[PDB]
Design a protein around this ligand. Structure first.
Ligand SMILES: NC(=O)c1ccc[n+]([C@@H]2O[C@H](COP(=O)([O-])OP(=O)(O)OC[C@H]3O[C@@H](n4cnc5c(N)ncnc54)[C@H](O)[C@@H]3O)[C@@H](O)[C@H]2O)c1
Ligand SMILES: NC(=O)c1ccc[n+]([C@@H]2O[C@H](COP(=O)([O-])OP(=O)(O)OC[C@H]3O[C@@H](n4cnc5c(N)ncnc54)[C@H](O)[C@@H]3O)[C@@H](O)[C@H]2O)c1
Lengths: 371, 366
């Protein structure tokens, strides 16, 4: 029984890109043909035992490149996805898809028009506890979802070098760089809100031009709401998603790692990740890095925690399945139709606008009933 | 020790109990009460007179001070007439259901030279007082952010209480204004700009909003988030205070205070003893499925934690009315600053929500 090989290029072979390469390489029917990275491409090509390309059009033009993993910095996703689509190459793109809805919409439409595949790297949807939460919600356990509350709040000391992840024009700041929590809320509420308000600023880090506190206030259709908090100036650390419905509530805690279901007077626990060891390992890490959350951000030469390494495996395996003709499940459909890429960058843009312009923003002000 | 004669206007759950308390303080007598419904009953218990007209009641020689504990909508008439007749005033939260109403009440009492104490009882919680001591000493550094919540689940009762009618209670924002007052005290004033969202999500048929989310912008790059309501199946009741060097949590569901500074973590009591804190926690656990039973009625009794701060407060008030100097700590409960700041910001939030836009507090002060 043959089983067809797909040739993968990797564009951007830093912390996350290098590791997606290590992972895809060892999946069934998958080969790393070549990578592109001006800084770290020679190094990671020696490790993966593949070629080095320096031009996108040359790279995509190769017969042996049928698919590309895009993991450049957040601001540099546009050019690699558009050229792969132009050369008939299927695409996986890291979060955040882009730093503007214009950019994200052009990327999804180009890939649709050239009939290639576009998978959005919204990796939180592969977390065991997120999947369990969706199963419980769809089964009607907590009833209709009324309210989601996210937070991703820690304290970051000012480092010796300022990373690109810390520059707003390159990272898009906390809202874009940690968009997982916005995407998560949007998935659980079944789409975008009608209207957002975001406040915050740089409260403690004025000396890294990023906002260090952000507070979002979302109004959804048919009387539902959400509140989302981010940043790097909170001396009381918090990282969770809370889901409150007509019959019950669910908490996915990522600081004290565990899931909680509340129904009647009853209270069940469930795993966020693949095993009690992964959950407990996460909890140890957050305890260790309470005084300085800055050490938690990846660099070329560092390695992801267990919980993250495992969902990267789940995700690279799901992607490889798709590219071998596997049917997509309703559960992950929105990572390919483009609905989730668009919904996350739309709402992010809407929030960014709200804050810089000091006013409430309708999501129509970013969509416009486009196509 | 001189005797002060107190009238009580409104002798339901809270008013009756403030009377029981003041009665047994040094230099304090309950001369008479007024309550169409429950006045005859509570006058038999307190062994005092019954009046049916405010002007007649205040006109008595023997009435030098009034405790006002009518429903939230009915504070205006009793405070203005007491001021007109030279009578000193204590008024229950929320002072009024409009800034116009609250401003008129503070100015009338100032103009007639009588005393006006705002019943912002959360400021007498041991853990609130401790939090202020820590903040002012510089332990957590500059306060950047406050996060309050008061979120539980209320089942729909057989009869609709006035506390559940928006026109009469002013809804969660006014009826549970303690948390807004608390944040305003810790941030040292009102915000520059507010946004409030929410609605009736689960209770359509009790016209109150059952979820409210406030987003406050303060001067010099500071913020707060405040949550309220009666449609949350994950109960939460706390105030969290995050600064440049540390953070403090006052938890009222899992009752205890927490200080975080460097890698250190200290516990402190919210209330007067570990028994009061634990008693609170038991109650919140007991009433998780229906927080509606926690709201007072004529004939019912406040928890230990609440009974005790009512004692702290009635004693502080009685001290003031015996010529005791006010401490900087409670000054704003008499100057009118706290009554005005709480109803201004509440009005601003209410406006924001019904009009679907951000509201500057200049739009209420100016
Ligand atoms: N899904 C997740 O959980 C997760 C976690 C971390 C990072 N990420 C995402 O991964 C992507 C990369 O982030 P990272 O953590 O690897 O950062 P990083 O600094 O570790 O990696 C960036 C790499 O891109 C290279 N690069 C720079 N310019 C390039 C160009 N023009 N073409 C190709 N490569 C170029 C850099 O030299 C570096 O090797 C981002 O989209 C980021 O948001 C995702
Ligand atoms: N500070 C606190 O912790 C706290 C707690 C509960 C209530 N309160 C406040 O106490 C006040 C009353 O609340 P409650 O719990 O006692 O409500 P309640 O229903 O228990 O008592 C209200 C009483 O006012 C009487 N009343 C009605 N109209 C009147 C009028 N025109 N003149 C005089 N009395 C009149 C009613 O008959 C009733 O006896 C409100 O301001 C409320 O917000 C404060």
């Amino acid at each position: 029984g043959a089983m067809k090989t797909v040739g993968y290029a990797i564009v951007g072979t830093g912390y996350f890109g290098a590791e997606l390469g290590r992972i895809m390489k060892e999946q069934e029917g998958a080969r790393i043909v070549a990578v592109l990275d001006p800084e770290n491409g020679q190094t990671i090509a020696e490790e993966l035992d593949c070629d080095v390309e320096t031009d996108l059009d040359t790279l995509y033009s190769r017969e042996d490149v049928e698919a590309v993993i895009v993991a450049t910095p957040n601001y540099l996703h546009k050019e690699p996805v558009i050229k792969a689509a132009e050369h008939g190459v299927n695409v996986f793109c890291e979060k955040p898809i882009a730093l503007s809805y214009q950019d994200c919409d052009e990327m999804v439409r180009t890939c649709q028009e050239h009939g290639v595949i576009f998978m959005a790297g919204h990796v939180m949807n592969f977390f065991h506890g997120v999947r369990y939460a969706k199963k419980l919600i769809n089964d009607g356990v907590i009833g209709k979802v009324l309210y989601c509350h996210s937070a991703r709040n820690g304290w970051e000391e000012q480092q010796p070098t300022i990373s690109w992840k810390k520059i707003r024009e390159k990272s898009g700041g906390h809202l874009y760089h940690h968009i997982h929590e916005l995407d998560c809320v949007q998935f659980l509420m079944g789409g975008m809100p009608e209207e957002v308000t975001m406040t915050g600023g740089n409260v403690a880090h004025q000396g890294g031009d990023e906002d260090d506190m952000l507070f979002v206030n979302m109004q959804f259709s048919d009387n539902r709401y959400a509140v989302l908090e981010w940043g790097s100036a909170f001396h009381w650390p918090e990282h969770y998603v809370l889901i409150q419905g007509t019959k019950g509530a669910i908490k996915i805690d990522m600081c004290d790692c565990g899931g909680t279901l509340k129904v009647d007077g009853r209270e069940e626990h469930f795993l966020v990740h693949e095993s009690q060891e992964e959950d407990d390992d996460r909890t140890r890490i957050y305890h260790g890095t309470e005084m300085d959350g800055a050490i938690m951000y990846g660099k070329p030469g560092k390695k992801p925690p267990m919980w993250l390494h495992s969902i990267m495996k789940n995700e690279m395996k799901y992607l490889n399945g798709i590219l071998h003709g596997k049917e997509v499940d309703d559960e992950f459909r929105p990572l390919l139709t483009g609905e989730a890429a668009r919904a996350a960058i739309a709402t992010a843009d809407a929030c960014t606008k709200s804050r810089f312009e000091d006013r409430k923003v309708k999501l129509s002000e970013i969509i416009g009933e486009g196509s």
